[PDB]
Design a protein around this motif. Structure first.
Motif, PDB file in Angstrom:
ATOM      1  N   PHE A 130       0.824  -1.199   0.000  1.00 21.81           N
ATOM      2  CA  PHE A 130       0.000   0.000   0.000  1.00 21.81           C
ATOM      3  C   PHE A 130       0.862   1.253   0.000  1.00 21.81           C
ATOM      4  O   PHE A 130       1.836   1.347   0.752  1.00 21.81           O
ATOM      5  N   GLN A 131       0.489   2.216  -0.839  1.00 24.05           N
ATOM      6  CA  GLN A 131       1.128   3.516  -0.916  1.00 24.05           C
ATOM      7  C   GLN A 131       0.071   4.612  -0.854  1.00 24.05           C
ATOM      8  O   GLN A 131      -1.055   4.415  -1.321  1.00 24.05           O
ATOM      9  N   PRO A 132       0.392   5.772  -0.269  1.00 24.26           N
ATOM     10  CA  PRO A 132      -0.605   6.854  -0.203  1.00 24.26           C
ATOM     11  C   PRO A 132      -0.915   7.488  -1.549  1.00 24.26           C
ATOM     12  O   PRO A 132      -1.945   8.162  -1.671  1.00 24.26           O
ATOM     13  N   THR A 133      -0.066   7.300  -2.555  1.00 28.48           N
ATOM     14  CA  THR A 133      -0.290   7.849  -3.885  1.00 28.48           C
ATOM     15  C   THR A 133      -1.008   6.875  -4.811  1.00 28.48           C
ATOM     16  O   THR A 133      -1.146   7.164  -6.005  1.00 28.48           O
ATOM     17  N   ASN A 134      -1.458   5.735  -4.295  1.00 29.89           N
ATOM     18  CA  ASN A 134      -2.151   4.753  -5.109  1.00 29.89           C
ATOM     19  C   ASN A 134      -3.558   5.238  -5.454  1.00 29.89           C
ATOM     20  O   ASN A 134      -4.069   6.212  -4.895  1.00 29.89           O
ATOM     21  N   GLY A 135      -4.188   4.536  -6.389  1.00 32.88           N
ATOM     22  CA  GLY A 135      -5.541   4.851  -6.786  1.00 32.88           C
ATOM     23  C   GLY A 135      -6.547   4.450  -5.724  1.00 32.88           C
ATOM     24  O   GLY A 135      -6.222   3.855  -4.696  1.00 32.88           O
ATOM     25  N   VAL A 136      -7.807   4.804  -5.985  1.00 33.69           N
ATOM     26  CA  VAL A 136      -8.883   4.494  -5.047  1.00 33.69           C
ATOM     27  C   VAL A 136      -9.094   2.987  -4.955  1.00 33.69           C
ATOM     28  O   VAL A 136      -9.270   2.435  -3.861  1.00 33.69           O
ATOM     29  N   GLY A 137      -9.037   2.292  -6.089  1.00 30.22           N
ATOM     30  CA  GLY A 137      -9.159   0.849  -6.076  1.00 30.22           C
ATOM     31  C   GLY A 137      -7.944   0.107  -5.568  1.00 30.22           C
ATOM     32  O   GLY A 137      -8.020  -1.106  -5.356  1.00 30.22           O
ATOM     33  N   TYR A 138      -6.825   0.802  -5.372  1.00 23.64           N
ATOM     34  CA  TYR A 138      -5.618   0.215  -4.805  1.00 23.64           C
ATOM     35  C   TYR A 138      -5.353   0.691  -3.383  1.00 23.64           C
ATOM     36  O   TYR A 138      -4.326   0.332  -2.799  1.00 23.64           O
ATOM     37  N   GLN A 139      -6.243   1.495  -2.820  1.00 29.00           N
ATOM     38  CA  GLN A 139      -6.160   2.072  -1.489  1.00 29.00           C
ATOM     39  C   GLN A 139      -6.643   1.074  -0.440  1.00 29.00           C
ATOM     40  O   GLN A 139      -7.455   0.194  -0.744  1.00 29.00           O
ATOM     41  N   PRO A 140      -6.144   1.171   0.795  1.00 28.16           N
ATOM     42  CA  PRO A 140      -6.579   0.236   1.840  1.00 28.16           C
ATOM     43  C   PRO A 140      -8.040   0.428   2.208  1.00 28.16           C
ATOM     44  O   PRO A 140      -8.533   1.553   2.303  1.00 28.16           O
ATOM     45  N   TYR A 141      -8.723  -0.688   2.438  1.00 27.68           N
ATOM     46  CA  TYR A 141     -10.122  -0.682   2.854  1.00 27.68           C
ATOM     47  C   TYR A 141     -10.261  -1.658   4.012  1.00 27.68           C
ATOM     48  O   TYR A 141     -10.018  -2.858   3.846  1.00 27.68           O
ATOM     49  N   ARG A 142     -10.645  -1.146   5.178  1.00 25.65           N
ATOM     50  CA  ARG A 142     -10.855  -1.999   6.339  1.00 25.65           C
ATOM     51  C   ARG A 142     -12.280  -2.530   6.326  1.00 25.65           C
ATOM     52  O   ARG A 142     -13.233  -1.763   6.140  1.00 25.65           O
ATOM     53  N   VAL A 143     -12.422  -3.842   6.514  1.00 25.26           N
ATOM     54  CA  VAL A 143     -13.700  -4.534   6.418  1.00 25.26           C
ATOM     55  C   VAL A 143     -13.965  -5.255   7.731  1.00 25.26           C
ATOM     56  O   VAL A 143     -13.100  -5.987   8.232  1.00 25.26           O
ATOM     57  N   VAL A 144     -15.151  -5.030   8.289  1.00 25.14           N
ATOM     58  CA  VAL A 144     -15.669  -5.770   9.434  1.00 25.14           C
ATOM     59  C   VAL A 144     -16.986  -6.406   9.009  1.00 25.14           C
ATOM     60  O   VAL A 144     -17.919  -5.704   8.603  1.00 25.14           O
ATOM     61  N   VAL A 145     -17.059  -7.727   9.094  1.00 20.84           N
ATOM     62  CA  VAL A 145     -18.255  -8.482   8.744  1.00 20.84           C
ATOM     63  C   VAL A 145     -18.882  -8.978  10.037  1.00 20.84           C
ATOM     64  O   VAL A 145     -18.298  -9.814  10.735  1.00 20.84           O
ATOM     65  N   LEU A 146     -20.058  -8.459  10.366  1.00 19.11           N
ATOM     66  CA  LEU A 146     -20.766  -8.827  11.579  1.00 19.11           C
ATOM     67  C   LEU A 146     -21.767  -9.924  11.256  1.00 19.11           C
ATOM     68  O   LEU A 146     -22.769  -9.673  10.579  1.00 19.11           O
ATOM     69  N   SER A 147     -21.488 -11.134  11.729  1.00 19.39           N
ATOM     70  CA  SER A 147     -22.350 -12.287  11.520  1.00 19.39           C
ATOM     71  C   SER A 147     -23.249 -12.466  12.733  1.00 19.39           C
ATOM     72  O   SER A 147     -22.761 -12.520  13.868  1.00 19.39           O
ATOM     73  N   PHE A 148     -24.553 -12.560  12.483  1.00 19.39           N
ATOM     74  CA  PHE A 148     -25.573 -12.634  13.516  1.00 19.39           C
ATOM     75  C   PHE A 148     -26.266 -13.989  13.476  1.00 19.39           C
ATOM     76  O   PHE A 148     -25.927 -14.868  12.680  1.00 19.39           O
ATOM     77  N   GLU A 149     -27.251 -14.138  14.358  1.00 21.12           N
ATOM     78  CA  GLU A 149     -28.236 -15.210  14.295  1.00 21.12           C
ATOM     79  C   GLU A 149     -29.502 -14.690  14.955  1.00 21.12           C
ATOM     80  O   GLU A 149     -29.470 -14.282  16.120  1.00 21.12           O
ATOM     81  N   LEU A 150     -30.609 -14.694  14.218  1.00 17.00           N
ATOM     82  CA  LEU A 150     -31.809 -13.970  14.615  1.00 17.00           C
ATOM     83  C   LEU A 150     -32.900 -14.929  15.068  1.00 17.00           C
ATOM     84  O   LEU A 150     -33.289 -15.831  14.317  1.00 17.00           O
ATOM     85  N   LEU A 151     -33.383 -14.719  16.299  1.00 14.62           N
ATOM     86  CA  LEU A 151     -34.643 -15.283  16.797  1.00 14.62           C
ATOM     87  C   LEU A 151     -34.641 -16.811  16.804  1.00 14.62           C
ATOM     88  O   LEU A 151     -35.606 -17.454  16.384  1.00 14.62           O
TER      89      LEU A 151
END
Ligand SMILES: *[C@@H]1O[C@H](CO)[C@@H](O)[C@H](O)[C@H]1NC(C)=O
Ligand SMILES: *[C@@H]1O[C@H](CO)[C@@H](O)[C@H](O)[C@H]1NC(C)=O
Ligand SMILES: *[C@@H]1O[C@H](CO)[C@@H](O)[C@H](O)[C@H]1NC(C)=O
Ligand SMILES: *[C@@H]1O[C@H](CO)[C@@H](O)[C@H](O)[C@H]1NC(C)=O
Ligand SMILES: *[C@@H]1O[C@H](CO)[C@@H](O)[C@H](O)[C@H]1NC(C)=O
Ligand SMILES: *[C@@H]1O[C@H](CO)[C@@H](O)[C@H](O)[C@H]1NC(C)=O
Lengths: 49, 99, 49, 50, 137, 99, 49, 49, 50
Positions: free
Chosen positions: B1-22
């Motif tokens: 990762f570099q700060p001069t990279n494109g938007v599609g090459y920029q870091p993206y932090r992902v949190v996936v919240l898995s639930f179980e309902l009722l």
């Protein structure tokens, strides 16, 4: 018969039953005799579009 | 990762919240504030996220510790375990259409 | 209905959406019939400093 | 964590208020499957894994 | 094209621009194999043309099975008894095998004497629970 | 038990009611078989499709139960016409017909 | 010949079971019609010369 | 036709034709018994003996 | 798509069942007439005209 009627007690007579007895254990894949890989390098990596 | 990279090459932090309902007793809930319990009356109710309209009666059913909801016919929730007081309340529809 | 938001909130201008805009600023009904249009305006709205 | 070894954390015995995340972090992607984001406030979850 | 079933060799002829076949238009009966240019027709694996003749569960737990519209020699082939549990292999073949015009009935003892009908099997054949104590046809 | 024609009526009615309440337990291609979960988890614009699928499945199951009731009512009507004819011709008079 | 049959049976089997019970009741009614027309007197008399 | 085979059900997508309980030989024997009893006896045919 | 296809096939089978109900009612009426004529005219003499 019990699973078809959804009951543990069946009455006297003849009952038509749906299939529960056979389950497939093996899988076969049959594709044509194709060897070469598709030229996606020409489509995707062309110097000009 | 570099700060001069494109938007599609920029870091993206992902949190996936898995639930179980009722399906089980719940330990994490939403920001909604609890209210009082109105027994033997027709009232809109919300038990552990389960919303409904009907009347509640006291039930003699016994729940296993891993069970929260009760369904005899599996298209309507008969009995629920009240989250604050551990008594089991069974739910009757408010509609008396047998007239 | 015209306004200005940032990019990450353009996803919130939709029926059934939540967020800061969809709760506190501008909410669309569930039975909404109409078109949401949004375009980048970094050249116009944003200024140096 | 890296994507090949992603970090799974259990969330329990607390109140799931996402409205505290409005001030600090802006989420470019927020997609809920099997639940609507508007109904997320008035719901209770059994087990939550991040 | 993915599915689950049995294949047999077919006498159908395909035009060179044809690959699949659909006589009923909701099930692909026939197909052309990609490697070898022979045409194979696909029969469903499900054999639901079987009827269980039983007395009451209160009375007994033994049954008979009528495989409908098949010959008694082709019963293991039709029901695929090799891929079944050994309990269904009891009703696949045995001594108590009777060929009727309605089908092949396995699990009931044929008797030359005749009585009134209580469980109608069909084509003039009836079944009963009569004496040790067993199902007679 | 020579009264196998009257017990068969009760058995057929019970078997039809079982079949109906077993069809009612299906989810008919929805996320849940109970309406409360659909109302609790989904906002109405996308919950309406699930609601329509579940209610349409329940109504089709009820329609099949109704058609089974027409068949049973036709058989019972034939038996009742025979019983009424025998009441009028043999209880209330003498019949020259054999058997 | 679907690749998943047991799931389809668990979701749509009781509907077809009720419809097949309806058709079986119709067939039994046809058999009772034939019996009530032809088998009123259950005595077999040999054809006289 | 009394000869229909399993290959027919596959063609009809499931639908099968159940044979009648009374064979045409058995219906013809009922008819012959009724004719012989009628011609020989008259009204006493159905009364037994 | 599977729900739509199977539901359509089941509705078509239901319409076939209702058509069979109408046909079975007509055949039942004809069979009742045949049984009445068997019991009244084959097995005995009838005073009814036509
Ligand atoms: C595409 O072309 C560039 C330039 O030669 C090369 O560096 C790259 O590896 C190519 N990618 C593929 C997938 O062929
Ligand atoms: C929940 O807290 C309230 C307020 O202290 C209390 O009255 C109530 O009994 C508590 N319920 C429990 C501990 O189940
Ligand atoms: C396809 O390739 C295999 C592997 O060499 C060969 O055995 C087979 O005969 C080939 N089939 C055709 C139709 O060429
Ligand atoms: C059968 O039914 C009778 C009552 O009709 C009951 O007494 C008996 O225990 C039952 N037997 C079995 C094996 O279910
Ligand atoms: C069944 O197979 C036997 C084997 O010879 C044959 O004699 C018989 O005719 C066959 N029955 C039918 C209905 O095809
Ligand atoms: C029934 O008839 C068949 C005719 O071949 C004969 O072989 C058999 O022994 C008979 N069985 C009895 C019990 O009479």
């Amino acid at each position: 018969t019990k699973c078809t009627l959804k009951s543990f007690t069946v009455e006297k007579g003849i009952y038509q039953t749906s299939n529960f007895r056979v389950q497939p254990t093996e899988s076969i894949v049959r594709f044509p005799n194709i060897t070469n890989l598709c030229p996606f390098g020409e489509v995707f990596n062309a110097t000009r579009f | 990762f570099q700060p001069t990279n494109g938007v599609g090459y920029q870091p993206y932090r992902v949190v996936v919240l898995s639930f179980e309902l009722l399906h089980a007793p719940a330990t994490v809930c939403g920001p909604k504030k609890s209210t009082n319990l109105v027994k033997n009356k027709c009232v809109n109710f919300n038990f552990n996220g389960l919303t409904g309209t009907g009347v509640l009666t006291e039930s003699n059913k016994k729940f296993l510790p891993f069970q929260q909801f009760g369904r005899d016919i599996a298209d309507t929730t008969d009995a629920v375990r009240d989250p604050q007081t551990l008594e089991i309340l069974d739910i009757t529809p408010c509609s008396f259409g047998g007239v | 209905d015209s306004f200005v938001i940032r990019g990450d909130e353009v996803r919130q201008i939709a029926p059934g959406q939540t967020g800061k805009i969809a709760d506190y600023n501008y909410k669309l009904p569930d039975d909404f019939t109409g078109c949401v249009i949004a375009w980048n305006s970094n050249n116009l709205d944003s200024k140096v400093g | 964590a890296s994507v090949y070894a992603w970090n799974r954390k259990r969330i329990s015995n607390c109140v799931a208020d996402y409205s505290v995340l409005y001030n600090s972090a802006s989420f470019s992607t927020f997609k809920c499957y099997g639940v609507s984001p508007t109904k997320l406030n008035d719901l209770c979850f059994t087990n939550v894994y991040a | 094209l993915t599915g689950t079933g049995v294949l047999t060799e077919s006498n159908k002829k395909f035009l060179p621009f044809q690959q699949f076949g659909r006589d009923i238009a909701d099930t692909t009966d026939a197909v052309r194999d990609p490697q070898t240019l022979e045409i194979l027709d696909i029969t469903p694996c499900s054999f639901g043309g079987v009827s269980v003749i039983t007395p009451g569960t209160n009375t007994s737990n033994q049954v008979a099975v009528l495989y409908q519209d098949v010959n008694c020699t082709e019963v293991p082939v039709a029901i695929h008894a090799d891929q079944l549990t050994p309990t269904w292999r009891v009703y696949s073949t045995g001594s108590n095998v009777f060929q009727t015009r309605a089908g092949c009935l396995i699990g009931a003892e044929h008797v030359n004497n005749s009585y009134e009908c209580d469980i109608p099997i069909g084509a003039g054949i009836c079944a009963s629970y009569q004496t040790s104590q067993s199902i007679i046809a | 038990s020579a009264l196998g024609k009257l017990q068969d009526v009760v058995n057929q009615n019970a078997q039809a009611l079982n079949t109906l309440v077993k069809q009612l337990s299906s989810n008919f291609g929805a996320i849940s078989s109970v309406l409360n979960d659909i109302l609790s988890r989904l906002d109405p614009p996308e919950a309406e499709v699930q609601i329509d699928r579940l209610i349409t499945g329940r109504l089709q199951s009820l329609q099949t139960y109704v058609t089974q009731q027409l068949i049973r009512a036709a058989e019972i009507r034939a038996s009742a016409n025979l019983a009424a004819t025998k009441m009028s011709e043999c209880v209330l008079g003498q019949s020259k017909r054999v058997d | 010949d679907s690749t998943e049959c047991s799931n389809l049976l668990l979701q749509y089997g009781s509907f077809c079971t009720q419809l097949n019970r309806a058709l079986t009741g119709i067939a039994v009614e046809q058999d009772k019609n034939t019996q009530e027309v032809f088998a009123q007197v259950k005595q077999i008399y040999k054809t006289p010369p | 036709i009394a000869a229909r085979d399993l290959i027919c059900a596959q063609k009809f997508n499931g639908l099968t034709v159940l044979p009648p309980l009374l064979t045409d030989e058995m219906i013809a024997q009922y008819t012959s018994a009724l004719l012989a009893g009628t011609i020989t006896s008259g009204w006493t045919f159905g009364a037994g003996a």
